[PDB]
Amino acid sequence: AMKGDTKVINYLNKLLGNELVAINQYFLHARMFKNWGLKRLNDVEYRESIDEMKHADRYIERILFLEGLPNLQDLGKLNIGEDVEEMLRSDLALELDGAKNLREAIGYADSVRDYVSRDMMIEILRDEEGHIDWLETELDLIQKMGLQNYLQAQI
Amino acid sequence: AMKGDTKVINYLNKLLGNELVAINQYFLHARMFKNWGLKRLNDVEYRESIDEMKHADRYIERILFLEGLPNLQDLGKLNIGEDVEEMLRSDLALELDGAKNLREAIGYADSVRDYVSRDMMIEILRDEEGHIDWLETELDLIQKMGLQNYLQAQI
Ligand SMILES: [Fe+3]
Ligand SMILES: [Fe+3]
Ligand SMILES: [Fe+3]
Ligand SMILES: [Fe+3]
Numbered sequence A, B: 001a002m003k004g005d006t007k008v009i010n011y012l013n014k015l016l017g018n019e020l021v022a023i024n025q026y027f028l029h030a031r032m033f034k035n036w037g038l039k040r041l042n043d044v045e046y047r048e049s050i051d052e053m054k055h056a057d058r059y060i061e062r063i064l065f066l067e068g069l070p071n072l073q074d075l076g077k078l079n080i081g082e083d084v085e086e087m088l089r090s091d092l093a094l095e096l097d098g099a100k101n102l103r104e105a106i107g108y109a110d111s112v113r114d115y116v117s118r119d120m121m122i123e124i125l126r127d128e129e130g131h132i133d134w135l136e137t138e139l140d141l142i143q144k145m146g147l148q149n150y151l152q153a154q155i
Helices: A006-036 A039-065 A084-111 A115-145 A147-154 B006-036 B039-065 B084-111 B115-145 B147-154
Strands: none
Touching: A006 A039, A006 A084, A006 A115, A006 B006, A006 B039, A039 A115, A039 A147, A039 B006, A084 A115, A084 A147, A115 A147, B006 B039, B006 B084, B006 B115, B039 B115, B039 B147, B084 B115, B084 B147, B115 B147
């Protein structure tokens, strides 16, 4: 019914890619956390991978509605941590860069008056910023407490 | 309780990577098929992504049990098709190469007498070969019938 802007489509595909990587990374990390007996951390990672799945859905829906083609695009490795701090750091690196990409896209969607795409991305960004926030606190505590002291209060 | 062979672990991580890519690709393709009104094709792609998820689980379980670390490793783009034939071809390219990697790994697991890893991979290979087979038939029919004639008998 309506072919959308092609740079918007190109942005949506870039963001979709970000989500797929986030999905795979939190799936792995969640399983590693669980293997260690860190219920709380596994719980949040697991639910996060579910959310990112949901974002990915929204993105694909939107590309298809705009008569665009899903088109990844080199996702890019992929930094599975070897300890909790490392894992959370890679996660936060992924999230921050994702948020950036979202902010640029939202800008461009608005310039070209794709308010539907813009508003969808804004809703998603809000989600991103909450997890970013959560992540920055955990890493703060590991810093302040020390990784071992931090873990043991999880257990 | 038991640190496993490190080349086996390295192989398991390579195969895990293959699964993650397969998961992301069939998730996308399944959604594209569905957007076109191809219930049967979407149904099989969707269920396939579920299976590959299950393989990924088995792999991560096994790496963790062998005191190995999940470690991807450049997944590699990623070839989303633009029509059904193209999509199925990319899928089959992915599957065949995956099967190959499995066969090498199974060989090596057996040489070093990791029968548990070997047997797990054999079970997985059997799954791979069935979908490969299914895929080779669909592509045969598209060839014999022509893509349009093929589709319309789906609908
Ligand atoms: Fe997201
Ligand atoms: Fe997020
Ligand atoms: Fe598989
Ligand atoms: Fe398969």
